[PDB]
Amino acid sequence: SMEQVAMELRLTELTRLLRSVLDQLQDKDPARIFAQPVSLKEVPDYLDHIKHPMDFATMRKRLEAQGYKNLHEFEEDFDLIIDNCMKYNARDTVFYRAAVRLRDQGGVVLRQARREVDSIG
Structure with missing residues (x-):
């Protein structure tokens, strides 16, 4: 359908907005402490402590x-990175x-992305 495509254009534009947001959040970690998963070879007990690594x-x-449906899901993942640490x-x-x-x-960054997502739809 023509609707499904219109849906897909917005998901793609959301992905486009969220990519820019991700780059901005990651620039705030110049030490790259949060760039990659915590290594299970180097912290073998990590999953006894943290149930949802991010x-x-x-x-x-x-x-x-395009696995993020809305900004809220994206924020949940960002918040995991912080709260797990x-x-x-x-x-x-x-x-x-x-x-x-x-x-x-x-x-x-998140404050303004929420306004942009509501605003642009």
Whole structure:
């Protein structure tokens, strides 16, 4: 159908908006602490602590499969990256502090993306 295509054009445009948002959030992690999954070879107990691991490369694979239906699903994944870090790592660590700064700095990008998604539809 002609509708399904119109749907697909918006999903594609959402993917286009979300890609730009992902790049902006990831620029806020210049140390690349959140770029890749936590290694199960290097932290073999990690899944005993964190049940839903997430990282920027994993979010990107989902994004490029147009696996995000709306901004809310995308935000859930971003929030996992932060909250998992803040649980696994103690307060006085470079990792925890990196997550606090990503959360704070990402807030502004996410604020505007929500207006853009409502606005453009």
